[PDB]
């Protein structure tokens with residue numbers, strides 16, 4: 001006898017497990033058991049992942065209901081799972097989206113100057129360098145302090161919450177409450193701080209005192225600061241780190257992009273497509289009985305949308321393991337999700353990776369791993385796949 005197939009399959013972010021293609025071909029929706037012991041439907045083809053993500057009867061908000069089958073334990077309060085819905089209901093969606101575009105005057109030059117400073121510091125210190133802790137994550141943190149309008153020197157303490165806040169745990173995490181309550185108190189103080197006049201928190205601070213938003217709660221304003229910092233920093237730092245592995249493992253492409261930097265946006269879109277940064281399928285709870293493939297999903301059941309299942313599906317992306325800069329469908333991957341919950345930071349996340357890669361390739365054209373690839377240590381039981389250190393030489 002064996003037990004039901006367990007997810008996730010592997011915390012490694014540098015290779016896709018052969019099980020994914022076997023599932024996708026033979027059983028593109030099939031039952032699995034999550035780390036909590038709950039059963040779920042794992043969906044692994046492009047067609048069925050898109051069907052679930054575009055049908056709001058597969059609800060994100062409902063995953064937080066008491067008694068639901070769970071992928072993992074909540075690390076935020078249950079109403080915060082509906083964060084974008086609460087931002088939309090408060091009349092703040094357009095304002096939030098406007099503040100986190102990468103097109104803000106000076107923002108790109110700030111990102112390039114920051115990237116070049118971090119790189120020069122590594123060059124001065126000498127190889128080996130850790131491109132996660134001393135490049136990708138400080139670049140993500142500096143970017144998000146600038147986009148929020150908060151002091152750069154407050155970035156490192158806010159960042160140190162994230163190794164707990166983005167855990168994928170079977171059980172509630174006492175330190176995630178301690179750090180969440182402290183980080184909310186910090187954002188509530190930012191909203192009362194007259195020095196904060198720029199970025200997303202300077203905008204929220206003004207709208208909080210405008211009569212049209214006098215009944216939006218202070219808790220929501222503070223929650224937008226904590227969630228957009230945390231989601232943006234973990235997501236951009238982790239994507240850029242694993243994209244740098246994928247580039248270092250393709251010297252032919254590295255060299256192409258160094259020679260023709262105008263191809264960096266196409267290269268980043270393929271690095272998004274092949275990225276294994278999300279450690280778990282995206283969860284949704286069915287609110288109706290819905291046919292998906294050969295399965296009738298029942299109301300109340302959990303569905304998990306496996307992004308690499310869609311993004312490596314050869315029916316959509318032929319030769320899916322290869323980075324090809326001339327595909328006819330290059331932005332149709334699911335790396336930012338799809339539908340109602342498509343990532344609101346997508347443009348910012350693209351620009352952070354394009355600028356970090358352009359800066360790295362000009363400063364360290366010979367960048368290579370300084371350890372054999374199997375020696376990277378992959379974080380476990382986390383919502384992202386990331387190596388704990390990324391040692392390189394150049």
Ligand code: HEM
Pocket residue numbers: 060083084085100227228229231232233235236239277282283334335336337338340341342343344345346348349350
């Ligand atoms: C390359 C970087 C990024 C990747 C790969 C990424 C990926 C994703 C994905 C896959 C979703 C959909 C989750 C779902 O449907 O269940 C999502 C949602 C989200 N992302 Fe991003 N993200 C990135 C950067 C950002 C940035 C820069 C921010 C903010 C500054 C951000 C904020 C959010 C938020 C707040 C949501 C929830 C949206 C909702 O619930 O409607 N992300 N992201």
Ligand SMILES: Oc1ccc(-n2cncn2)cc1
Pocket residue numbers: 075076080081083084165166167227228230231383
């Ligand atoms: O809109 C958001 C929802 C959940 C999160 N987090 C999930 N784990 C940690 N934060 C961040 C933003």
